[PDB]
Design an enzyme around this catalytic site. Sequence first.
Site, mmCIF file in Angstrom:
data_model
loop_
_atom_site.group_PDB
_atom_site.id
_atom_site.type_symbol
_atom_site.label_atom_id
_atom_site.label_comp_id
_atom_site.label_asym_id
_atom_site.label_seq_id
_atom_site.Cartn_x
_atom_site.Cartn_y
_atom_site.Cartn_z
ATOM 1 N N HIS A 206 0.825 -1.217 0.000
ATOM 2 C CA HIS A 206 0.000 0.000 0.000
ATOM 3 C C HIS A 206 0.856 1.262 0.000
ATOM 4 O O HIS A 206 1.606 1.514 0.958
ATOM 5 C CB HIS A 206 -0.884 0.033 1.239
ATOM 6 C CG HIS A 206 -1.670 -1.215 1.433
ATOM 7 N ND1 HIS A 206 -2.653 -1.620 0.542
ATOM 8 C CD2 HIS A 206 -1.620 -2.161 2.408
ATOM 9 C CE1 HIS A 206 -3.195 -2.748 0.982
ATOM 10 N NE2 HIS A 206 -2.583 -3.106 2.105
ATOM 11 N N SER B 110 1.800 -0.403 -5.214
ATOM 12 C CA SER B 110 0.842 -0.695 -4.147
ATOM 13 C C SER B 110 0.324 -2.138 -4.256
ATOM 14 O O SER B 110 0.356 -2.747 -5.341
ATOM 15 C CB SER B 110 -0.317 0.308 -4.226
ATOM 16 O OG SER B 110 -1.081 0.192 -3.022
ATOM 17 N N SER C 196 -5.678 1.695 -2.256
ATOM 18 C CA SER C 196 -5.033 2.077 -0.983
ATOM 19 C C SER C 196 -3.952 3.136 -1.126
ATOM 20 O O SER C 196 -3.472 3.682 -0.114
ATOM 21 C CB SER C 196 -4.428 0.834 -0.338
ATOM 22 O OG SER C 196 -3.458 0.242 -1.217
ATOM 23 N N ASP D 200 3.194 -7.528 0.695
ATOM 24 C CA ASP D 200 2.032 -7.435 1.574
ATOM 25 C C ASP D 200 0.864 -8.050 0.809
ATOM 26 O O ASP D 200 0.333 -7.456 -0.144
ATOM 27 C CB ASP D 200 1.772 -5.992 1.986
ATOM 28 C CG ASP D 200 0.600 -5.846 2.931
ATOM 29 O OD1 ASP D 200 -0.400 -6.577 2.824
ATOM 30 O OD2 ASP D 200 0.668 -4.964 3.806
ATOM 31 N N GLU E 82 4.162 -9.312 4.985
ATOM 32 C CA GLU E 82 3.545 -8.447 5.999
ATOM 33 C C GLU E 82 2.259 -9.000 6.579
ATOM 34 O O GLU E 82 1.956 -8.713 7.747
ATOM 35 C CB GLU E 82 3.238 -7.092 5.312
ATOM 36 C CG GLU E 82 2.453 -6.079 6.075
ATOM 37 C CD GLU E 82 3.350 -5.164 6.871
ATOM 38 O OE1 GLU E 82 4.566 -5.247 6.666
ATOM 39 O OE2 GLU E 82 2.822 -4.378 7.712
ATOM 40 N N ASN F 124 4.270 -10.991 9.654
ATOM 41 C CA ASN F 124 2.980 -10.864 10.320
ATOM 42 C C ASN F 124 3.058 -11.414 11.728
ATOM 43 O O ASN F 124 2.483 -10.815 12.656
ATOM 44 C CB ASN F 124 1.862 -11.559 9.540
ATOM 45 C CG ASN F 124 0.476 -11.263 10.178
ATOM 46 O OD1 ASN F 124 -0.054 -10.137 10.043
ATOM 47 N ND2 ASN F 124 -0.099 -12.261 10.870
ATOM 48 N N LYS G 2 3.989 -7.035 15.358
ATOM 49 C CA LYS G 2 3.171 -6.780 14.170
ATOM 50 C C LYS G 2 1.771 -7.294 14.472
ATOM 51 O O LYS G 2 0.856 -6.490 14.680
ATOM 52 C CB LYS G 2 3.790 -7.463 12.928
ATOM 53 C CG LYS G 2 3.314 -6.878 11.586
ATOM 54 C CD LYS G 2 1.831 -7.203 11.316
ATOM 55 C CE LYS G 2 1.498 -6.651 9.927
ATOM 56 N NZ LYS G 2 0.161 -7.290 9.562
ATOM 57 N N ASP H 282 -0.319 -3.877 14.902
ATOM 58 C CA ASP H 282 -0.933 -3.486 13.632
ATOM 59 C C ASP H 282 -2.317 -4.124 13.443
ATOM 60 O O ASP H 282 -3.313 -3.419 13.274
ATOM 61 C CB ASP H 282 0.056 -3.897 12.552
ATOM 62 C CG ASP H 282 -0.433 -3.748 11.139
ATOM 63 O OD1 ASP H 282 -1.615 -4.020 10.826
ATOM 64 O OD2 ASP H 282 0.442 -3.398 10.289
ATOM 65 N N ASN H 283 -2.398 -5.456 13.456
ATOM 66 C CA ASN H 283 -3.677 -6.090 13.137
ATOM 67 C C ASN H 283 -4.761 -5.678 14.124
ATOM 68 O O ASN H 283 -5.945 -5.535 13.756
ATOM 69 C CB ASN H 283 -3.502 -7.628 13.134
ATOM 70 C CG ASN H 283 -2.457 -8.120 12.125
ATOM 71 O OD1 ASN H 283 -1.443 -7.472 11.905
ATOM 72 N ND2 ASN H 283 -2.726 -9.286 11.489
ATOM 73 N N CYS I 291 -6.451 -1.693 13.286
ATOM 74 C CA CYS I 291 -7.866 -1.726 12.881
ATOM 75 C C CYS I 291 -8.767 -1.063 13.905
ATOM 76 O O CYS I 291 -9.789 -0.463 13.543
ATOM 77 C CB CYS I 291 -8.310 -3.175 12.662
ATOM 78 S SG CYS I 291 -7.444 -3.941 11.247
ATOM 79 N N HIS J 286 -7.784 -8.637 3.844
ATOM 80 C CA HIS J 286 -6.926 -8.222 2.713
ATOM 81 C C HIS J 286 -7.589 -8.246 1.302
ATOM 82 O O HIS J 286 -7.222 -7.406 0.434
ATOM 83 C CB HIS J 286 -5.648 -9.077 2.705
ATOM 84 C CG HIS J 286 -4.657 -8.599 1.686
ATOM 85 N ND1 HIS J 286 -3.928 -7.446 1.877
ATOM 86 C CD2 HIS J 286 -4.351 -9.051 0.434
ATOM 87 C CE1 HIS J 286 -3.157 -7.243 0.810
ATOM 88 N NE2 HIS J 286 -3.410 -8.187 -0.087
ATOM 89 N N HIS K 100 -4.010 2.458 8.654
ATOM 90 C CA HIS K 100 -3.582 2.608 10.040
ATOM 91 C C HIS K 100 -2.765 3.889 10.194
ATOM 92 O O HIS K 100 -2.061 4.320 9.260
ATOM 93 C CB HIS K 100 -2.673 1.470 10.509
ATOM 94 C CG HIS K 100 -3.289 0.100 10.483
ATOM 95 N ND1 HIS K 100 -4.636 -0.141 10.329
ATOM 96 C CD2 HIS K 100 -2.685 -1.105 10.577
ATOM 97 C CE1 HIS K 100 -4.847 -1.448 10.352
ATOM 98 N NE2 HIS K 100 -3.664 -2.055 10.476
ATOM 99 N N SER L 35 5.248 -2.229 12.552
ATOM 100 C CA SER L 35 5.243 -3.178 11.428
ATOM 101 C C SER L 35 6.434 -2.972 10.507
ATOM 102 O O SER L 35 7.075 -3.927 10.069
ATOM 103 C CB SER L 35 3.964 -3.010 10.613
ATOM 104 O OG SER L 35 2.817 -3.176 11.436
ATOM 105 N N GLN M 93 9.735 -5.113 9.173
ATOM 106 C CA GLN M 93 10.046 -5.363 7.770
ATOM 107 C C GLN M 93 11.498 -5.032 7.477
ATOM 108 O O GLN M 93 12.158 -5.755 6.730
ATOM 109 C CB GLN M 93 9.156 -4.526 6.850
ATOM 110 C CG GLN M 93 7.755 -5.081 6.605
ATOM 111 C CD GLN M 93 7.761 -6.272 5.671
ATOM 112 O OE1 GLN M 93 8.782 -6.839 5.392
ATOM 113 N NE2 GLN M 93 6.588 -6.638 5.177
#
Lengths: 468, 468, 470, 463
Positions: free
Chosen positions: C55, C78, C83, C132, C194, C219, C224, C228-229, C233, C339, C389, C397, C401
């Site tokens: 993204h 992306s 996105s 990703d 990711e 992930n 992460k 992140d998840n 969200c 996703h 996010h 995240s 990476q």
Amino acid sequence: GFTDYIVKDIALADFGRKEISLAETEMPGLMATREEYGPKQPLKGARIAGSLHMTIQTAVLIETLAALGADIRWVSCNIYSTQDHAAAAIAAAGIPVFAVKGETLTEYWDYTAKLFDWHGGGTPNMILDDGGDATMLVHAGYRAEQGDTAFLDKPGSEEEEIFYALVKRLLKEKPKGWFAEIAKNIKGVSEETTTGVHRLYEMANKGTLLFPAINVNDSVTKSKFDNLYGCRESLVDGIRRGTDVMLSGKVAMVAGFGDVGKGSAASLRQAGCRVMVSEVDPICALQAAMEGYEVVTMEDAAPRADIFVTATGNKDIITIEHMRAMKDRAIVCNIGHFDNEIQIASLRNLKWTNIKPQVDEIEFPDKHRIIMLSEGRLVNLGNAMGHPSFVMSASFTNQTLAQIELFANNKDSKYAKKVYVLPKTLDEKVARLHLAKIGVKLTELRKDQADYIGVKQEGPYKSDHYRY
Amino acid sequence: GFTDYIVKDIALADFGRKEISLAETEMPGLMATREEYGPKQPLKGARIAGSLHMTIQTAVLIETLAALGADIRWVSCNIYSTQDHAAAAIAAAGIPVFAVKGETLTEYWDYTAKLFDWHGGGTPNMILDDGGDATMLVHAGYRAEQGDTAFLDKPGSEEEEIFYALVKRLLKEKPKGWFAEIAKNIKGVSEETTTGVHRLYEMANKGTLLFPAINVNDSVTKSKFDNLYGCRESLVDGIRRGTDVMLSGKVAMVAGFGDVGKGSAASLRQAGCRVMVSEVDPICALQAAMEGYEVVTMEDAAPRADIFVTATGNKDIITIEHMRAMKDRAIVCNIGHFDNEIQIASLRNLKWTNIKPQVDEIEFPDKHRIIMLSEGRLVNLGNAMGHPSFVMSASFTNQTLAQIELFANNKDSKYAKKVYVLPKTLDEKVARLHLAKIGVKLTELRKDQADYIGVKQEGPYKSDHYRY
Amino acid sequence: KPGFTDYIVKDIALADFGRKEISLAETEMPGLMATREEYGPKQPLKGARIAGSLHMTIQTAVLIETLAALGADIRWVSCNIYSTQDHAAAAIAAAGIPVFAVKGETLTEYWDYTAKLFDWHGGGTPNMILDDGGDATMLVHAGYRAEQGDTAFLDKPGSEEEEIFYALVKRLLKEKPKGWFAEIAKNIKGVSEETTTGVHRLYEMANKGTLLFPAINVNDSVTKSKFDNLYGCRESLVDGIRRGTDVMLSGKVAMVAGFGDVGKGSAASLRQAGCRVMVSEVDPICALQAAMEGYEVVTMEDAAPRADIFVTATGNKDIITIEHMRAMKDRAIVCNIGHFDNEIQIASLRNLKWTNIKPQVDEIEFPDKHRIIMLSEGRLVNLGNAMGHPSFVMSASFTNQTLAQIELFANNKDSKYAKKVYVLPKTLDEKVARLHLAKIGVKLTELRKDQADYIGVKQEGPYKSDHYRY
Amino acid sequence: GFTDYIVKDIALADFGRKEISLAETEMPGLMATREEYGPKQPLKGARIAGSLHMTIQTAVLIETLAALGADIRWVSCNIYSTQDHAAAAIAAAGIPVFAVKGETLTEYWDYTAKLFDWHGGGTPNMILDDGGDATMLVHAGYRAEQGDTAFLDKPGSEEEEIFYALVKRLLKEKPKGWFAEIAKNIKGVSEETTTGVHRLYEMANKGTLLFPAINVNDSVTKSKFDNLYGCRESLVDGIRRGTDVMLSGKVAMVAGFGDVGKGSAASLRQAGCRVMVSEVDPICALQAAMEGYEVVTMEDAAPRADIFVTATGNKDIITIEHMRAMKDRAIVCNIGHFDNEIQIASLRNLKWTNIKPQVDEIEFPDKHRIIMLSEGRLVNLGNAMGHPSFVMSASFTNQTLAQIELFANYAKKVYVLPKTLDEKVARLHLAKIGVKLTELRKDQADYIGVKQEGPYKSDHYRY
Ligand SMILES: NC(=O)c1ccc[n+]([C@@H]2O[C@H](COP(=O)([O-])OP(=O)(O)OC[C@H]3O[C@@H](n4cnc5c(N)ncnc54)[C@H](O)[C@@H]3O)[C@@H](O)[C@H]2O)c1
Ligand SMILES: NC(=O)c1ccc[n+]([C@@H]2O[C@H](COP(=O)([O-])OP(=O)(O)OC[C@H]3O[C@@H](n4cnc5c(N)ncnc54)[C@H](O)[C@@H]3O)[C@@H](O)[C@H]2O)c1
Ligand SMILES: NC(=O)c1ccc[n+]([C@@H]2O[C@H](COP(=O)([O-])OP(=O)(O)OC[C@H]3O[C@@H](n4cnc5c(N)ncnc54)[C@H](O)[C@@H]3O)[C@@H](O)[C@H]2O)c1
Ligand SMILES: NC(=O)c1ccc[n+]([C@@H]2O[C@H](COP(=O)([O-])OP(=O)(O)OC[C@H]3O[C@@H](n4cnc5c(N)ncnc54)[C@H](O)[C@@H]3O)[C@@H](O)[C@H]2O)c1
Ligand code: NA
Ligand code: NA
Ligand code: NA
């Protein structure tokens, strides 16, 4: 003419039975486990020595084990956690139990030893442990019996000196080779709590573990339910019953943000406190900060908070220097397994005034006071009733399944003298058994959806490393 | 040689005094009131008859009134709300109190009458009331004494029968004109709770109110603190101590979303329940929906909620038909002032099994059961310890100031035989007294800012119609 | 620079705005910025040729410039057609980095841009993939499989995107030198992946033995998945719904399908914003978690006539069907935060009447005049209707990476990473968390040696067993 | 052939109409009011000058007034709160509207004056005001027209100098007696927001208020819903769209804990911030502490919060001395009605860098920076889309009922709607969100002393 028990008052049995009946309705996993395994009697021939808080919830576990065929002796694993009406109901059912709320440390250890003098002769052949104390007695005695005895005179806490004295008394009084005899006969131990599991892995790492062990704590349906939601429900219950303070308007400090500390911080925030947290693990500290908690040291918190709770499983978390700096009548308590999270021993030259059972006011030279709950032992079990039945149904279904694994399903030596966890299909089964009670309607994957994510429609649904 | 009391066990006094001391630290408004008014003795010569739950918090109120000069007699305003150690401590201080947790309804009403037989002879000259029962005794007796007796023969409940029998007994056993003599001598009544205030305004509007009254419930620092945050803390406390159930995963139904219902629904949601609400007022219903609660009828909720709480101040909210429809072992309780929110009398031909004090299992012919808390009387006080001290300090500072107003600040008849509320200046003062204890740092208006918004730097800061 | 044309963005004039928000994001991304300062002198990625498919947001721009500051040569696209943040893409193009990323590009453009990653400037191929969702990885593996002679799968597409992807693979086989995919596979030193859906694709290949190069599963770094998840969200799902619809959430009922990390965060997003939230689940443990957190756990058939808002969060397919949508209340809102866009049966709607409201918001009308409001045509709603996010959680995240690219590119001289899937060691996971504490005012306690011995750990960590779940 | 309007982009009208349609579904009280009163035409003959944020929600209010018979002219009451597609749709519907997102203060006051030059001739005969600016124009002009003109030479702010220049320009251009003619024809004003009601009671107490007014803000179904839940939804929306920061992990400071401060603190805490609050009122401070917020002074908060929000209705809440002390790139914004809660004027000597519309970075001599949202004007409306439609339906059903009362149907010159109307507003909103209200039985109603159909509470009940 049954007399093989020590409880406060056998006359409390009728009250105990009423609350056990109520708890059965709240413990569908245990009751479903009775229904399933009752006919197969997988625990017939098991002689289970249990060391686990003698609560109403434990009484339902004990009667489940007995319904599956087990012969049982039981003690509590904390001097203040027994619910005397539960203990009396078990004694009245003819099951040897040695458990009194408020027993002394000497009594506590003498009772633990009574687990191993099986009624009718012999020893147990299974241990069900919470905190590792029964396991520890067997290993320490075996260590000494093999001739390694100097550790029994190592300086220790008051309880440690009592424990070493017990081991010496048993070496002197029991037939030579008693501990090896016990260790030979134990087919496995299942252990309930984080502190006891750490003790297990230390023994396995040192090569001293004497029998197979299942770590029940790290079932997903134990650690992420009992340690988390159980403390979310029962920490504030203990504080309220001990102190009856208003929690809205107060600041609370929670040391630790593992599973118990997460639940403990939530208990207090949900009850109205503004909660601060300490941590040594940067991942858990970042979790706490992302959940909106101020993350501080205990030195920062000591003059700031109204309520302090230790939730680490470690030692020397709240010290006499912290308590010297607290505001007058700050409340201090511990929800980790053992009473060395707080420096209680350092307080024993101060003036203590008992308020009621498990509540004391401690006065410093400068006249400021702190309110101590359960003398620094587990506050949810000492000042209230521990976790509620429904979440203990999940923990104790795990326990029952682990006893079945170690006693009945080890005919190919699939459990060596190592530490194991239950398989994910059984972890998922434990959760399944609790869904109907609380009104969950589970969706089923269609076949092509199961194929799309690479799982069987009946599970397991997650990889081995999934963290939930 | 002091004997003018009825309590469960006078030997509980030392325990009561220890918890009174602890509550004093938690009640900075009452303690500051003692320090301010102690020297002036504004209640010297007052003879205060109090009818108000005989808790530890009430004991701090009683001793505040005494510190200001008052002579006192006390009873509880509910048969299950006394804390026996608080009652004992008051009795041991030489203050007449007639209050036992679990007293009978006949005892309850006989004790209320004992308020008016002042020690040494004579009557009270002030009433401090919670629920209006002491005020009702005076007014009903006066009505009958003046010749209107027919109502005494039409009792609508067992309670009404005991109360009318009491009035008849007093008309025979007390001197001619006793009720008019009391009414003459009472300079005022201050009334604590929504139900009692409703009864006051009924009498005021009909012209039967016999003396000036202050409505303390509608102080901002009472209704928006005690009724709201007090119940937020103490409703789940009562349900936990009565049942020890897990609240996470449960569905709860609260009837009413006024101040008590708001606090009650929050108590349950914060503790993990999914909460539904009923309401008859569309504004309160829209509030509940905006706070995320599902708003349903009791008929919709009856077969599916795990926990039911009545919070309306109204009658016939949970009926025998609702209870017949409930799931097995649903929990039912009431946090409104009087027990007729639930149709308890409609249950009296069913099988009742006592579990422990204030907890009963009621079994229907089809074998389903319900769990009833405190026989339908105020659950926070009957099954636990009522609201915590800090919020009661706000309520009870209002009560002390109201007693001062009626007893000492009515020389000019500013208070006629009507209902009044305390002025906003006093309401703001009560809040101010509680800020330091919980660490609030108040901002001061700069002079320019006070002018800009047209208030004085010292307040009051809001219009008289402001709702907070 | 005038000579530089190797990019495709919506509008290069957005670069100055892009740069201002990149500067602001830098302050909010302390982990990435600290990683620059630490590894910049050492240049661990000098010689790396990184093909990135992720993204193209402001947050990704800070990641790209971090990789470049560590020595990497880079080409970027992306991983979703809605996105991209066009000002971020413009700023990267204006920095002279090839990027092919437009918010609202077509599926055909999307896949042609992915293929441009592999046409390295100056000749040759990438030697690293940063992925990703697994699309760049899938292009290399599908092309390899076909090039080795297994072409049957290319002829059997079962979605619009699949047929476009299969036609791309055929085109590249036709147009590139023979053996092109095998040459790519030989040169890729590793892929770091990711997101949950991409990591599932990786383990499928590793289990079939078809994975062509080492892979790091980013992930499942704790810092992460559990940040992140979850918190990402929690912050960005309701942001997407608000920007798309501006509805009042207090008073509404919401349905979240799934209670994994994204579903947990999604359900909290909606509850915290005022909705009464219902959840569906197939996993009994996750279902019991949701019930313990106070959510009613129901099936989608039960929810379909009840809820005002529907969010799919499963990573699975066919979660919201035409039958569900037909049963919904008029002007119910439907969206997806997993996703890929097959959680909702969008294709089943394509002969209904669609009325565009504004970008990424459509009203869909059934023959019976019943309507639903669809966000981002069923594509990731947080990235499509809002800004994804926020930066701070993306720093965790993207620090993972960066560390995974350094592992695969610079720390595999001994071949410690074979052709299978690895996670970062816990000490690195812990370091990522440490790097983010000062910015948010966390004060970490130091273990004394006796306390560390007591719980069986080193004072410097790792503090938890391998199987600890946090 | 209609051009009697000023909107940014009339081509947005189709987009505005689509979002108005969506908002209608979300505004059941307004729509039910159209259904009941449309055929009664209670506002036939009304000429309503409205000054109220020209949003999609206000468009639904405008079209409701028109469906009740009213003739209308409209402006926004803030320079950044207009939603240009809503303005364009109202223009396209043939209603004069003068409202542009980003109009200047000069334009703002010129547009307000256009309310009073009624199309076809004459003046309005009703005002619908949010913040009191249209009301103030009438009263200031009336004061000056009665000979008292020296105050117009003594402004206190840039905005007041523009306002006073406007009054002077109108006294010079309009027929002699124009302000008295307007004042004579205005039958009443309904006023939406706390600050505007404060202005009305000032005029009523000084004896200068020229016509009856309804205080709409203190309907229960306005103050306890719009100010509280509306800000709970829209404050964090504004901050997110302006900055895209992570709120979990941040500390936020809210000045004030009245209805807007309560909603604002909740917005931030529910979004993940740790929230501190300031207050001057000990009762509101005690409420904040019992809701678990740390109550501190702005001086305490200045060096340590990440986000600052003013919610007081007062002035000089965040000063240049506070901002000098803030951390680098702290976010500062205002959700009270007027921008003078923050000392924006004192910042005009520093370096400003525009990031995007309604977002600026301000750099101090020592190089620390702050991020300012909407130049200190209402952040929910300037950086996002204001409150959502459903809660505005409650506010604007009150407004519509108040216009009916003043136009078609006490002692105090400023009054509130009766509780039976307040209750009606709530009742109109229950079915759309699935609420089932219980009906009292006659004996239950008697027991608590109310009629079955209400009103259910005493007039002093605080909810
Ligand atoms: N009272 C109960 O009913 C109950 C329930 C379950 C477990 N327990 C006990 O609770 C304790 C904690 O268990 P857990 O499962 O949460 O363990 P855990 O390992 O998940 O969490 C403990 C946390 O404490 C942190 N920590 C260690 N030393 C610290 C220090 N000096 N300062 C601050 N933080 C520190 C660790 O980093 C860790 O995150 C154990 O003793 C366990 O047996 C009690
Ligand atoms: N247990 C305690 O500690 C405590 C504390 C304060 C007050 N009280 C008592 O609680 C009761 C409620 O007090 P309050 O201050 O909340 O009163 P309130 O008037 O603020 O609220 C009562 C609510 O009940 C609603 N209601 C009335 N009849 C109903 C019905 N049939 N179904 C559903 N809702 C109905 C009303 O509309 C009202 O909103 C009173 O009896 C009061 O004296 C108890
Ligand atoms: N939009 C974002 O910013 C973002 C953030 C992280 C990940 N993702 C994506 O979100 C998706 C979910 O990721 P995750 O990490 O939560 O995965 P996860 O495996 O932790 O959770 C998915 C959950 O969905 C449940 N599920 C599967 N099929 C279901 C069905 N038919 N009905 C109900 N529940 C069902 C599973 O049991 C599981 O618990 C993936 O596609 C991932 O790549 C999106
Ligand atoms: N942006 C919006 O959509 C919106 C919504 C409704 C109203 N408003 C506006 O918000 C403002 C606040 O309105 P309200 O209804 O909350 O008013 P309120 O009177 O209910 O609350 C204001 C609070 O600010 C406090 N205060 C005053 N000066 C202070 C200071 N120096 N420091 C700290 N606190 C101070 C007061 O004590 C009071 O409690 C008004 O200007 C109102 O018009 C905005
Ligand atoms: Na229990
Ligand atoms: Na973002
Ligand atoms: Na809006």
